[PDB]
Scaffold this active site. Structure first.
Site, PDB file in Angstrom:
ATOM      1  N   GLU A 130      -5.028   9.642  -7.195  1.00  0.00           N
ATOM      2  CA  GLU A 130      -5.859   9.798  -6.004  1.00  0.00           C
ATOM      3  C   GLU A 130      -7.224   9.158  -6.247  1.00  0.00           C
ATOM      4  O   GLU A 130      -7.890   9.483  -7.226  1.00  0.00           O
ATOM      5  CB  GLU A 130      -6.022  11.274  -5.644  1.00  0.00           C
ATOM      6  CG  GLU A 130      -6.539  11.521  -4.234  1.00  0.00           C
ATOM      7  CD  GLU A 130      -7.240  12.860  -4.088  1.00  0.00           C
ATOM      8  OE1 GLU A 130      -8.242  13.083  -4.797  1.00  0.00           O
ATOM      9  OE2 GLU A 130      -6.795  13.692  -3.270  1.00  0.00           O
ATOM     10  N   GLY A 266     -11.971  16.636 -12.410  1.00  0.00           N
ATOM     11  CA  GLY A 266     -12.133  18.057 -12.171  1.00  0.00           C
ATOM     12  C   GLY A 266     -10.814  18.778 -11.985  1.00  0.00           C
ATOM     13  O   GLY A 266     -10.434  19.617 -12.808  1.00  0.00           O
ATOM     14  N   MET A 268      -6.774  17.952  -9.892  1.00  0.00           N
ATOM     15  CA  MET A 268      -5.934  17.120  -9.042  1.00  0.00           C
ATOM     16  C   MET A 268      -4.646  17.862  -8.722  1.00  0.00           C
ATOM     17  O   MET A 268      -3.986  18.386  -9.625  1.00  0.00           O
ATOM     18  CB  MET A 268      -5.621  15.779  -9.708  1.00  0.00           C
ATOM     19  CG  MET A 268      -4.776  14.866  -8.844  1.00  0.00           C
ATOM     20  SD  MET A 268      -5.500  14.635  -7.210  1.00  0.00           S
ATOM     21  CE  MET A 268      -4.034  14.272  -6.248  1.00  0.00           C
ATOM     22  N   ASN A 270      -1.587  17.296  -8.282  1.00  0.00           N
ATOM     23  CA  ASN A 270      -0.340  16.581  -8.527  1.00  0.00           C
ATOM     24  C   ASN A 270       0.855  17.511  -8.345  1.00  0.00           C
ATOM     25  O   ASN A 270       0.877  18.625  -8.877  1.00  0.00           O
ATOM     26  CB  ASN A 270      -0.339  15.992  -9.935  1.00  0.00           C
ATOM     27  CG  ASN A 270      -1.461  14.999 -10.151  1.00  0.00           C
ATOM     28  OD1 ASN A 270      -1.679  14.102  -9.338  1.00  0.00           O
ATOM     29  ND2 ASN A 270      -2.185  15.158 -11.252  1.00  0.00           N
ATOM     30  N   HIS A 302      -6.494  27.033  -4.823  1.00  0.00           N
ATOM     31  CA  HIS A 302      -6.777  25.835  -4.038  1.00  0.00           C
ATOM     32  C   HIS A 302      -5.709  24.770  -4.259  1.00  0.00           C
ATOM     33  O   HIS A 302      -5.085  24.288  -3.306  1.00  0.00           O
ATOM     34  CB  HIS A 302      -8.161  25.286  -4.392  1.00  0.00           C
ATOM     35  CG  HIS A 302      -8.483  23.982  -3.729  1.00  0.00           C
ATOM     36  ND1 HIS A 302      -9.273  23.894  -2.603  1.00  0.00           N
ATOM     37  CD2 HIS A 302      -8.120  22.712  -4.033  1.00  0.00           C
ATOM     38  CE1 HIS A 302      -9.382  22.627  -2.242  1.00  0.00           C
ATOM     39  NE2 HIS A 302      -8.691  21.891  -3.092  1.00  0.00           N
ATOM     40  N   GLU A 303      -5.488  24.385  -5.518  1.00  0.00           N
ATOM     41  CA  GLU A 303      -4.559  23.298  -5.803  1.00  0.00           C
ATOM     42  C   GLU A 303      -3.116  23.701  -5.528  1.00  0.00           C
ATOM     43  O   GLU A 303      -2.310  22.859  -5.118  1.00  0.00           O
ATOM     44  CB  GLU A 303      -4.717  22.835  -7.250  1.00  0.00           C
ATOM     45  CG  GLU A 303      -6.160  22.594  -7.680  1.00  0.00           C
ATOM     46  CD  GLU A 303      -6.839  21.484  -6.898  1.00  0.00           C
ATOM     47  OE1 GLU A 303      -6.133  20.627  -6.325  1.00  0.00           O
ATOM     48  OE2 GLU A 303      -8.087  21.469  -6.857  1.00  0.00           O
ATOM     49  N   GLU A 325      -8.368  18.725   2.567  1.00  0.00           N
ATOM     50  CA  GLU A 325      -9.236  19.468   1.661  1.00  0.00           C
ATOM     51  C   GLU A 325      -9.908  20.650   2.347  1.00  0.00           C
ATOM     52  O   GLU A 325     -10.160  21.672   1.699  1.00  0.00           O
ATOM     53  CB  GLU A 325     -10.290  18.536   1.062  1.00  0.00           C
ATOM     54  CG  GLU A 325      -9.704  17.403   0.237  1.00  0.00           C
ATOM     55  CD  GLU A 325      -8.912  17.901  -0.956  1.00  0.00           C
ATOM     56  OE1 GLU A 325      -9.277  18.957  -1.514  1.00  0.00           O
ATOM     57  OE2 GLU A 325      -7.923  17.238  -1.334  1.00  0.00           O
TER      58      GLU A 325
HETATM   59 ZN   LIG Z   1      -8.000  19.991  -2.624  1.00  0.00          ZN
END
Ligand SMILES: [Zn+2]
EC number: 3.4.11.14
Length: 864
Positions: A130, A266, A268, A270, A302-303, A325
């Protein structure tokens, strides 16, 4: 900019990368099953930092046609592969072997420096695609809407772990090298290239099984598997939450969370292999903090939310990145609040993304959330704290407007419809409009296609047992009434609550008019009315004088929820600063907060009062506002005391430090006396004070101390064992008030004892210490400008140095002095900070000149 021709779209990527460690390169071959949608003699792909050895296209059942035409375009990161004859419509196999580089740019397939539990310093093969860096690991159609499946294979040494999106299905040895083993992973589902991942390195792990049966693992550096235990149990509970909320199971067979040393990105998202930095995922029991377990719960939720919203359904283009996001930034708090209600995490969300978004959206040079993105480089330019914080804020307002019932139903319809596909922002409004029957596309267009947010004025009149409400909307600006003849309008969903039921809605409305009347049935005059329940709506509320006085009991008896008390106080300071209401009216409300127990509310209370105190330091009654601050913080100060009480939380220790530091700076005699007891017992080795009381004690004894106190702090710093203890002193050194000591602290900032990256913190504490300390800091950076400019030019520090130094000025003549200084001594990288600071100085100047004597006469009359 123009996207790829799409005459040849991929179907399946068969990749086998062999990371050549120590040489910092890698070679890999690609067998891409593709479809020729239109007869062409050339194939255009994305590719960067990769030279192709050979390439051929083999149609179904035919001989391959080797490409005799190569065209590398580095500015566009695209490569055109020409062929002798037309490939014709059908299915084929593009076979490309190539070579690449494990760069040091922390992008694509790069090298990650890590140190073994002994040293030696090794490197790992870590990925990060990304936004458009998958083209640096292998040539591909590097666009989110061009989805395909991936067969990942890695040839790694036997003593190194190889992870990827899927699970390992085979682990056969390498024939040419006995020391290597080819690791093949399962086939991914239809996904985007920027979500593919594979990492090669040395890692330990802890594993568990979620209630859905999904295998969860947390990979840590060698020898730190126990540190990933908390992130493991949080991830194990996070998957069933999003499973129940979306009514869609986890799309992959396993989820992995790997902590990487100095991971630049920070975090990602994936698909199946979420990467973090170890300082954000693992909890070191001898280095972490108190709220670290709270920060871990947020970053995991979050991820893992992206595994559905973002990875299962992907944005059509980078224009919709704010929605990807913003949604995850909102639902992460919903997940943590459900699994950990003892955090009251929504109060911190309002204090973080919400208030920060309202600050930027009320100033000049703002922009709407959704902006059309042409070139993928325009992303990094037009998305900032506005598109993400306000993006998450309008999603929260939308969820409250929809209701959790229909919102869950619309998301299930959305995910199941576009699963393994792509969608735009308008596709989400349709799925939510189908499930709710509310005009979602029309309402959300007013919050996404234009900048700014409205100010809602409300007035109340008692009509029998009902109360008539008169509402009006206008664009809010930090300066005051918006000057401009466009007259922006918003479709504002408004939730109203009364004292009879302060935690649930009395009435939900949608304000689609510039003015609107509302009747609240059965509302007695002794009851108060609160607009924007839970501070869910992205707008500020201006109450009439009568309505504001009715809310005072709700603040005092704590019946008004803490998130509502937070937003109400935050709106009052903005309105008073904008000249819409008087500052005296805000000061009278501060006396109702004497019973406030919440740390987040006091944090914003202390911040707003600090701005006013430093503002009123330009007047001749700075003693009167300090006496006012002491009266506000005295009751909470006596309640907390100095020592931790049996069974306290982590916020109570933070709240004690904030309150004691506030009272200590304001000159509270009992606080100053006790702080000197702790400080004199700390320096004499009689009883070292706690790390929670360390910063407030230092601030208090140094502001009310002399040259002897400063020499003691300097002895504590030059003798300080660790760097953390040094930074705690560097921030508080500016609290000294004597001019010769202030100059000694400023010279100490540029000395060899202070590292250059921490010099701005020392000078920043001087500017925020006092009025004369601010003028001395501004004169210090002008006399030593040649050295300071050579230090931090073109970097983040030079903008932070200007910000912390001039933002405190309250004279409009001073704003013209900082603009004239940087016109003769240019600072190009900080061009935007100077304009924001000049607008902020003129704002504080007009605020000070308008309300100075009114505040003065209020403080004198109140004292009598
Ligand atoms: Zn995010």
């Amino acid at each position: 900019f123009e996207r790829l021709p799409a005459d040849v779209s991929p179907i399946n990527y068969s990749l086998c990368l062999k990371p050549d460690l120590l040489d910092f390169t890698f070679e890999g071959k690609l067998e891409a099953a593709a479809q020729v949608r239109q007869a062409t003699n050339q194939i255009v792909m994305n590719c960067a930092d990769i030279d192709i050895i050979t390439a051929s296209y083999a149609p179904e059942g035919d001989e391959e046609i080797h490409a005799t035409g190569f065209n590398y375009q580095n500015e566009d990161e695209k490569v055109t592969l020409s062929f002798p004859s037309t490939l014709q419509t059908g299915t084929g196999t593009l076979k490309i072997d190539f070579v690449g580089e494990l760069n040091d740019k922390m992008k694509g397939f790069y090298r990650s420096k890590y140190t073994t539990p002994s040293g030696e310093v090794r490197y790992a093969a870590v990925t990060q695609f990304e936004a458009t860096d998958a083209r640096r690991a292998f040539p591909c159609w590097d666009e989110p809407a061009i989805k395909a499946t991936f067969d990942i294979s890695l040839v790694v040494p036997k003593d190194r772990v190889a992870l990827s999106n899927m699970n390992v299905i085979d682990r056969k040895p390498y024939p040419d090298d006995e020391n290597l083993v080819e690791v093949k992973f399962a086939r991914t589902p239809v996904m985007s290239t920027y979500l593919v991942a594979f990492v090669v390195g040395e890692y330990d792990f802890v594993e568990t099984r979620s209630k859905d049966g999904v295998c969860v693992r947390v990979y840590t550096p060698v020898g730190k598997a126990e540190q990933g235990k908390f992130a493991l149990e949080v991830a194990a509970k996070t998957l069933p939450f999003y499973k129940d909320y979306f009514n869609v199971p986890y799309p992959l067979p396993k989820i992995d969370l790997i902590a990487i040393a100095d991971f630049a990105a920070g975090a990602m998202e994936n698909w199946g292999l979420v990467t973090y930095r170890e300082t954000a995922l693992l909890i070191d029991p001898k280095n972490s903090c108190s709220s670290s377990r709270q920060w871990v719960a947020l970053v995991v939720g979050h991820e893992l939310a992206h595994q559905w919203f973002g990875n299962l359904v992907t944005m059509e283009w980078w224009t919709h990145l704010w929605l990807n996001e913003g949604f995850a930034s909102w639902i992460e708090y919903l997940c943590v609040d459900h699994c950990f209600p003892e955090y009251d995490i929504w109060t911190q969300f309002v204090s973080a993304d919400y208030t920060r978004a309202q600050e930027l959206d009320a100033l000049d040079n703002s922009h709407p959330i959704e902006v059309s993105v042409g070139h993928p480089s325009e992303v990094d330019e037009i998305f900032d704290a506005i598109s993400y914080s306000k993006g998450a804020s309008v999603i929260r307002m939308l969820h409250d407007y929809i209701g959790d019932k229909d919102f869950k139903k619309g998301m299930n319809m959305y995910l199941t419809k576009f699963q393994q596909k792509n969608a735009a922002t308008e596709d989400l409004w349709e799925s939510l409009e189908n499930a709710s029957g509310k005009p979602i596309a029309a309402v959300m267009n007013t919050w996404t296609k234009q900048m700014g947010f409205p100010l809602i004025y409300v007035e109340a009149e008692q009509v029998e047992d009902d109360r008539l409400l008169r509402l009006s909307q206008k664009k809010f600006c930090a300066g005051g009434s918006y000057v401009g003849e466009d007259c922006p309008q918003w479709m504002v969903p408004i939730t109203i609550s009364t004292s009879e039921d302060p935690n649930q809605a009395k009435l939900k409305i949608l304000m689609d008019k510039p003015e609107m009347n509302v009747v609240l049935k059965n509302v007695k005059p002794d009851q108060w009315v609160k607009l924007n329940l839970g501070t869910v709506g992205f707008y500020r509320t201006q109450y009439s004088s009568a309505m504001l006085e009715s809310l005072l009991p709700g603040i005092r008896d704590l019946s008004l929820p803490p998130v509502d008390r937070l937003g109400l106080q935050n709106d009052l300071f903005s309105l008073a600063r904008a000249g819409i209401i008087s500052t005296v009216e805000v000061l009278k409300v501060m006396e109702a907060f004497v019973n406030e127990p919440n740390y987040t509310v006091w944090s914003d209370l202390s911040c707003n009062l600090g701005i006013l105190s430093t503002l009123l330091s330009h007047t001749d009654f700075y003693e009167e506002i300090q006496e006012f601050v002491k009266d506000v913080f005295s009751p909470i100060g006596e309640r907390l005391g100095w020592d931790p009480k049996p069974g306290e939380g982590h916020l109570d220790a933070l709240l004690r430090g904030l309150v004691l530091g506030k009272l200590g700076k304001a000159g509270h005699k009992a606080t100053l006396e006790e702080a000197r007891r702790r400080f004199k017992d700390h320096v004499e080795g009689k009883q070292i004070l706690s790390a929670d009381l360390r910063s407030p004690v230092y601030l208090t004894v140094l502001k009310h101390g002399d040259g002897t106190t400063l020499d003691i702090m300097l002895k504590l710093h030059k003798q300080a064992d660790m760097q953390e203890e040094k930074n705690r002193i560097e921030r508080v050194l500016g609290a000294t008030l004597l001019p010769d000591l202030i100059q000694k602290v400023l010279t100490f900032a540029l000395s060899e004892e202070v590292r250059p990256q921490d010099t701005v913190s020392v000078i920043g504490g001087v500017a925020g210490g006092s009025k004369h300390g601010r003028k001395a800091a501004w004169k210090f950076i002008k006399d030593n400008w040649e050295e300071l400019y050579n230090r931090y030019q073109g970097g983040f520090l030079i903008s932070r140095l200007i910000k912390l130094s001039v933002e405190g000025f309250a004279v409009d003549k001073m704003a013209g002095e900082v603009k004239a200084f940087f016109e003769s001594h240019p600072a190009p990288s900080a061009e935007r900070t100077i304009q924001q600071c000049c607008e902020n100085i003129l704002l504080n100047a007009a605020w000070l000149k308008r309300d100075a004597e009114s505040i003065h006469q209020y403080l004198l009359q109140r004292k009598a």
